[PDB]
Amino acid sequence: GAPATVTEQGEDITSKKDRGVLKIVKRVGNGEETPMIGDKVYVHYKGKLSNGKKFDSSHDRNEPFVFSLGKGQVIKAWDIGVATMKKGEIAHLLIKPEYAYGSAGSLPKIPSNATLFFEIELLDFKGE
Numbered sequence: 722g723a724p725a726t727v728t729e730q731g732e733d734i735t736s737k738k739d740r741g742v743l744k745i746v747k748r749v750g751n752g753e754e755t756p757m758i759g760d761k762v763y764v765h766y767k768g769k770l771s772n773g774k775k776f777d778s779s780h781d782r783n784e785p786f787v788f789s790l791g792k793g794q795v796i797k798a799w800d801i802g803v804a805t806m807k808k809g810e811i812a813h814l815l816i817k818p819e820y821a822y823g824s825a826g827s828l829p830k831i832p833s834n835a836t837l838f839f840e841i842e843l844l845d846f847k848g849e
């Protein structure tokens with residue numbers, strides 16, 4: 722399924738090229754402009770432990786997830802990943818624990834040394 726496809730086919734978008742964040746564009750967006758650091762960003766997402774079935778979904782809360790880009794309000798993989806996305810794009814991310822919740826994890830939702838998968842739709846973004 723989706724996680725294995727990102728392992729096999731995803732682009733490494735880390736600076737270090739450690740395969741810590743892998744991305745596939747699943748639907749192309751429009752802009753030739755990505756959000757910049759500090760921007761207010763609006764997304765829908767579905768997220769799960771890479772080995773794991775049950776998703777966490779913004780849809781469950783009946784509203785978009787909103788955060789300021791590059792301010793560490795989200796895991797590092799999101800600050801890296803969403804900075805590469807255009808408005809309307811849907812991307813898949815597969816994330817090693819170094820770019821997510823590391824050795825400590827974040828219980829009870831995330832255990833130690835967890836790989837995460839996300840599908841993210843970039844809905845909108847506005848400058849600070």
Ligand SMILES: COc1cc2cc(OC)c1OCCCn1cc(nn1)CCOC(=O)[C@@H]1CCCCN1C(=O)[C@H]2C1CCCCC1
Nearest residue numbers: 766768769770776777786794795796799827830831837838
């Ligand atoms: C670690 O706590 C959660 C993690 C996630 C979902 C949660 O609730 C729906 C979590 O409870 C906290 C309340 C909501 N929240 C999260 C964040 N800010 N607010 C930022 C920390 O989260 C993140 O940076 C990432 C990316 C942005 C969406 C949420 N997110 C998560 O890591 C999810 C987890 C995805 C993998 C499966 C378990 C939830």
